[PDB]
Design a protein around this ligand. Structure first.
Ligand SMILES: C[C@@H](N[C@@H](CCc1ccccc1)C(=O)N[C@@H](CCCNC(N)=[NH2+])C(=O)Nc1ccccc1)C(=O)O
Ligand SMILES: [Ca+2]
Ligand SMILES: [Ca+2]
Ligand SMILES: [Ca+2]
Ligand SMILES: [Zn+2]
Ligand SMILES: [Zn+2]
Length: 168
């Protein structure tokens, strides 16, 4: 696995997130679930905990957008870049943005929001890209035949634990 240069990481174990807005593709509940599951993935292997906020600034601000969306990294329309997030830190750092120009499905027929959310969150916590192809943190998304066979690789776990340690 690889972490970001300088090894930036949250200096606290309890992070707040806030789904700023939703995609029209899925009902609010399918979106909420996808992100709770997303975070749960990391919560299970570290001493990290998360609480949701509806107002103000959360550590991880989550939102769906297209093309120019208020940052130095515009989305590219359909395909290619699906979403992007920022390594741990203040302000925009830690936030995750999802290209709403994709078709967010809750399965593998389009772009699965659960998986993408899971990968991007890996970035919000300090994990960069892995060279292992079976690792969630691998550079490219790929159509999983099964969402029921998904699990973090020992690599993704090794990495997150090297940063926040194992769960107490
Ligand atoms: C770029 C950004 N977002 C990635 C997430 C990919 C991912 C991996 C594993 C699970 C879920 C999601 C992203 O959007 N990647 C694109 C490709 C970017 C290519 N850029 C480049 N080579 N310079 C991606 O995987 N796209 C894609 C689109 C349709 C189907 C399959 C994959 C990042 O993490 O740095
Ligand atoms: Ca933030
Ligand atoms: Ca795109
Ligand atoms: Ca969309
Ligand atoms: Zn953005
Ligand atoms: Zn990535």
């Amino acid at each position: 696995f690889r972490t970001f240069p300088g090894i930036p990481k949250w200096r606290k174990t309890h992070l707040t997130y806030r789904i700023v807005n939703y995609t029209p593709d899925l009902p609010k509940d399918a979106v909420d679930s996808a992100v709770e599951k997303a975070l749960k993935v990391w919560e299970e292997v570290t001493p990290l905990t998360f609480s949701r906020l509806y107002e103000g600034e959360a550590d991880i601000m989550i939102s769906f957008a297209v093309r120019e969306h208020g940052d130095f990294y515009p989305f590219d329309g359909p395909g290619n870049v699906l979403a992007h997030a920022y390594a741990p830190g203040p302000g925009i750092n830690g936030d995750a943005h999802f290209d709403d120009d994709e078709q967010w499905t809750k399965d593998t027929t389009g772009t699965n929001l659960f998986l993408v959310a899971a990968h991007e969150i890996g970035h919000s916590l300090g994990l960069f890209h892995s060279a292992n192809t079976e690792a969630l943190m691998y550079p490219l998304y790929h159509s999983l035949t099964d969402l029921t066979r998904f699990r973090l690789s020992q690599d993704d776990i090794n990495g997150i634990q090297s940063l926040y340690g194992p769960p107490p």
